[PDB]
Design a protein around this ligand. Sequence first.
Ligand SMILES: [Fe+3]
Ligand SMILES: [Fe+3]
Ligand SMILES: [Fe+3]
Ligand SMILES: [Fe+3]
Ligand SMILES: [Fe+3]
Ligand SMILES: [Fe+3]
Ligand code: NI
Ligand code: NI
Ligand code: NI
Ligand code: NI
Ligand code: NI
Ligand code: NI
Lengths: 170, 170, 170, 170, 170, 170
Amino acid sequence: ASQVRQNYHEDCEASINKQINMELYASYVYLSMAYYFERDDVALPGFAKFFKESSDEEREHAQTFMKYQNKRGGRIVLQQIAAPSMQEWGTGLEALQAALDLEKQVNQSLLELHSTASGNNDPHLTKLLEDEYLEEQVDSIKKIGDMITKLKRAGPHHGLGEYMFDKELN
Amino acid sequence: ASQVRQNYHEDCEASINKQINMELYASYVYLSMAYYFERDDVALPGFAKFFKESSDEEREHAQTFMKYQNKRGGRIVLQQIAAPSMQEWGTGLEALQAALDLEKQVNQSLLELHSTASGNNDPHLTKLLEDEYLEEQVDSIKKIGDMITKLKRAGPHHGLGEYMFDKELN
Amino acid sequence: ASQVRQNYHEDCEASINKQINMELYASYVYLSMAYYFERDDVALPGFAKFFKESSDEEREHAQTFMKYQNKRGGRIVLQQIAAPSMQEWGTGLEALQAALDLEKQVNQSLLELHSTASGNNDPHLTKLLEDEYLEEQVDSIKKIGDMITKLKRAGPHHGLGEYMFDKELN
Amino acid sequence: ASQVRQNYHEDCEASINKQINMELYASYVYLSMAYYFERDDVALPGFAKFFKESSDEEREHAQTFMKYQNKRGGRIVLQQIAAPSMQEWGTGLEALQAALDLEKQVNQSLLELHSTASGNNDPHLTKLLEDEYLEEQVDSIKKIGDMITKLKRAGPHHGLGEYMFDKELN
Amino acid sequence: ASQVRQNYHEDCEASINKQINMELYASYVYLSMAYYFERDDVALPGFAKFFKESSDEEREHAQTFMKYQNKRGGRIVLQQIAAPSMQEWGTGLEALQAALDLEKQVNQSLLELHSTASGNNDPHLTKLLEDEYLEEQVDSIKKIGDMITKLKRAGPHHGLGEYMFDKELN
Amino acid sequence: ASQVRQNYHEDCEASINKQINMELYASYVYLSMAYYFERDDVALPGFAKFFKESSDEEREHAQTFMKYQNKRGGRIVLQQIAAPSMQEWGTGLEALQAALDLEKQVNQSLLELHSTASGNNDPHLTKLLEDEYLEEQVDSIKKIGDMITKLKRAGPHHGLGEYMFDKELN
Ligand SMILES: [Fe+3]
Ligand SMILES: [Fe+3]
Ligand SMILES: [Fe+3]
Ligand SMILES: [Fe+3]
Ligand SMILES: [Fe+3]
Ligand SMILES: [Fe+3]
Ligand code: NI
Ligand code: NI
Ligand code: NI
Ligand code: NI
Ligand code: NI
Ligand code: NI
């Protein structure tokens, strides 16, 4: 085995490879949304910017797991990245709602990964999950929830409220 | 008695202790409103900021009365701070209207305290009330009244007007 | 329920509301001590400064729990803040000893809150408690213990030692 | 159709969507190589850096095609991104040789895309391909060829030459 | 007992004293290696620098445990520091391999200390171990593993590769 | 023998190895004292700082002998470092008195080492001892003697004098 490996269970190694693919997938979803909002018949530049940043961040999140895998002595196994569920995302509200659901799905996976790490007595992995993923995930979920409420207040259907709220994200 | 006490009536000393508690209570009310507007299902960051500042200022107002008590030779007696009347404050308009009523209630108490001080021929206390409390209270009441009128103009019910007016407070 | 809530148990939500009240209470205790030491017949400006800072910090600690509540989707419930146990705090030594006991009481509550969070498998809450509260609480307790020992060395009864030690806190 | 579309053939629109997927795939290949060279039993930090930059650039290349699609009035269709052909890439020489082949494969696709655009008399698309893709592709191929020759000179098998050549890329 | 002690088990107190001695011992091992590589018949200034820094860091690690002991109310008990196992360390490769084994030995001890702290429900101690020791230990082990692989690539036996690799550490 | 060795007697080589261990031991003694004075029931931060600096300096003194050994062609032999004679050091006065005795013990050893070097006609070693050790040792002894006298004047028993004198060292 790896000269560096120590207290690193095969199940955590495999779950990290699954989380890598999921982070890359979420990055791909947000990339799809980003350029959907730059279509000439959508033209929501604030939403496009918001989702392009989230796409970059999720790709960074994937790479932090890849560095982590190598650091512990695991071996990165990269799978296929699925096409995004949608090709068109509707209104800003509907995209935010899809993002909220995705973020909560990633959070569930991460909490399961923490349970795996905790069950195998790997405090180094639980620390990584708490400090670098679980904290960020809760803040992201709270932020998206705030945005949904703000957009529902401003007027969530294709109108002046959506146009004004989009400026808040620019 | 206190080596410093001079022309300081027991009734003014007691009324100051009552005003201290009332300032601390108003600070607590505004703190409740501040974090109500940061709930994910309210998301009014301008109102939250406005009330968090008012909460800090009312706590400062309480401390200025505590310094004053010590300066005159009175003795600070701290009571229980009551829970805020509400736990949820409705719309921005309703919170402003509750704040307006509270400010006018504090003003009434302060004017009564001035009458107590004037009745006991304490010009040092009347000066404190006029220069540090009564001036600020009238400006606060005028400001909140302005805000209520502006929010009623922009559209006071949970809609685009409330969302736009909230930006004026950010 | 809240669009953001996830893996957030009702018991942790309720314990956070209890800790909020306790942080606000400790803030109130330290505020009482702060202005006790500014009485003209006490005149310990270093102790007053030390306790006024601790009062501000405990109010900040309360607000961090209020932000946390909102972040997780819980609902803040604010109760009555009890009057401080004492209105007069004796010598500097006696105030420090009362502060030490209060800090250890808050620490016990926080460790219980960690046990609640751990029992409900909430690593996000255990992380908050470890990184933002338990670390600060142990440092505060060690610091107060140091101060008590230093004041006992300098001369803890109302004399030159207390006067000189007070300058160390200015 | 799109209010902006003009002289934009359905075949060019479809070929752009195919090139987007291929750019994303090459980005994924280079990402795999990048973290392969950070394995503790490979430890080639110069190669890792070189491939991580190429991974970022190919993702940028994909996005430029996505902006282009939207600019012309086409509609972005995102497919599945295939897993990289390899999970382990051997020596630096073998990775460079795999990169050279991939770059020449992308170049072939781009030249075919130019033939499609030229056959449909779309000078705007031929200009994009010449100015933004074909130029970069030839420079990349020449650079990788230079590197292969340099590494073959320094000593391409796992030895001092590979270790010294890796420093040239750091 | 100590006026500050709270939730601090005698077994954790004793294990900290054992870890202090082990950190001081590792510091001593690295000090031996550092000046071995400055012998006139070894003359590997990069290795000497690398091990002198690790010697300083392990002594700092020991002191952080000594501060921690005092912070929790435990009592520092200092034992004998054993002579390093070797007086001469061979080649750079052999010293790195000895360092790797020592680092993994310290890591095992620290993970056991975490299990002790976790078994006694001391989250403050588990936090210290995760944030200040376990993170650093894994990075150190990964770094040494990288170095071993790099030196095996450059040529690990007393030759040009060892001479060139030594410059990477200067 | 060493290609560099010249006029370097085996007895001086062995005495240097003995002095190395003694410098490391004194460093360990001062480290013990340093963190004794940071105990919550001692709280003498000036003494702690003074002894932590002396601990660092004695470790530097050990390293200068290790560099010297290598410079002359001798071979460093590292022994066991004994536990400090005490685990608790009493008052500041008692620690200073223990330090004074230790410094005079090291001085005696160094003067014996000078006699060894002089007896073997090694002027290079006598120069090192005079310029780098004997000068520093006499200044240290004079300084500690000054401090003892100053602390005896201020009031050496656990009281205001010890508390005030401790500030002189901060
Ligand atoms: Fe993520
Ligand atoms: Fe007020
Ligand atoms: Fe607190
Ligand atoms: Fe490309
Ligand atoms: Fe260490
Ligand atoms: Fe010395
Ligand atoms: Ni709609
Ligand atoms: Ni309404
Ligand atoms: Ni007393
Ligand atoms: Ni080969
Ligand atoms: Ni060999
Ligand atoms: Ni004594």
